[PDB]
Amino acid sequence: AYYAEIMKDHQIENKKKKEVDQDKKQDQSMYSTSFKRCCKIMERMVVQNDQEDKYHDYRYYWSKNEGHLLPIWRFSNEKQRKKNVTSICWNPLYPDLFAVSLGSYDFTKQRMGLICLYSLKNTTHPEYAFNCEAGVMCLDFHPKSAALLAVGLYDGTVLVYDIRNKHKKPIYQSTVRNQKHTDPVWQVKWNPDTSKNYNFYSISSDGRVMNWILMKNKLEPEEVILLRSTLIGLACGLCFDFNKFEPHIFLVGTEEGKIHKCSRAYSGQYQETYNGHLLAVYKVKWNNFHPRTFISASADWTVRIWDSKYTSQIICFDLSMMVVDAVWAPYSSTVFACATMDKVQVYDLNVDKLNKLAEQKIVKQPKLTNLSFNYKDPILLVGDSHGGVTLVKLSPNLCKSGPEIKQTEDKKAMEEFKNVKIEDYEREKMENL
């Protein structure tokens, strides 16, 4: 009552939410926006009580040169068992919400692809669905505004979505008039810079690195570089990555097998080439907390660690089964994960020089299409060939500043002692060879 008289006293920003409601008497009365929240909350809290045993483990089960990987939850759909997981990504704002992009591998068989944004909140079905025309190969989130979702699919069409929008149609599309690349788009990434609107980067198997800029009801394409010898056509490209320290320098993997370092500055020239690999490189990724160092994972069952200055690899990691993808750990440098024919394998360079710390089989029935790392917590995501996406929390035996616990009290060390330790390890391999 008292509060009602204060609103009458001070009529400044009069209370909206006018009582039009839904009405309609019968056949779906209201059941719509405040009540939707209550329905959504109820669902999650019903799940929570049945998964309480797994949720109590997930937070603080807490899992000397040994590692242990525990699979917790599997997110799948029985309609969507035909498609492969391909690319996965986490929202930069929210560490709970991640997006998986189901598409078709194996070429000869081709179906439609549905992008699924699974929240860690609700593990039963996705938070958002997105039906598309062909199989979605690459997915990514824009580091600044996590709503902006970058999509690549077959016939090299580039899609942009907003999670905010309710209608769930693509905000943007590439056409033949907007110079869309042919064949597919294996990898797609957002440019962190927001000075020139919103820069979206893509690579095709046609082999043209395309920079896309967001405009009002139009997409402006710009050819960054061409992949390009006594052969026919342009060289195929299966992955690219931009160095976070130097935005000019960016690496690109090829079907030829030869990885290339490339500048945004000079379009028709290569900075350097690496004639290490023998077959198609699936994923190249720069290491965290150090420049001029990166992993690549190729069809030829070998995972290799380069330094940009050197022309050949520093270390290789021969596994019998095919290497599918390798991804750097974000929390610590000198830690990466490699998935091979139902076998996920994590390494640490400080703990062991060659030998694997931990090897685990998340799921027995399928093969593993892709894995991606969370930046907030120690948790790896692992995709299956049957569109199933299992997460795995790593052991605390692996960590950073390990030699002595809380020694010297260096805040700078967490982004510098990591920069120093790979250099100290890098020198060791140069003495060996």
């Binding site: 405040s34 329905c39 909350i41 109820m42």
Partner: protein
């Protein structure tokens, strides 16, 4: 819409859930999806009074702060209620 009417169908189909019952602000049954009617009639009358009584508890301590979600936990059963001004959603989930 598939989205409210599907999620409500999904939580019912979900294993170890006795039934979801929507209560109208005037203590009335909009949807009631339990096995025996006595339980559904009993839940329709009894629980929305507990939620109004439990709303006055949180309200007295801080009259800005309103009830968003109430969960009771009994010996055999759990009782979870998501109250709103237009409608209140009620569920009974057996403890694992």
């Amino acid at each position: 819409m598939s989205e409210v009417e599907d999620t409500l169908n999904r939580i019912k189909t979900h294993k170890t859930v006795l039934g979801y019952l929507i209560v109208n602000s005037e203590g009335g049954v909009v949807r009631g999806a339990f096995k025996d009617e006595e339980e559904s009639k009993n839940i329709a009358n009894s629980i929305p009074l507990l939620t109004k009584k439990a709303r006055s508890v949180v309200r007295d301590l801080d009259p800005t702060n309103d009830l968003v979600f109430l969960r009771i936990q009994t010996k055999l059963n759990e009782i979870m209620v998501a109250p709103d001004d237009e409608f209140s959603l009620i569920v009974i989930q057996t403890k694992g």
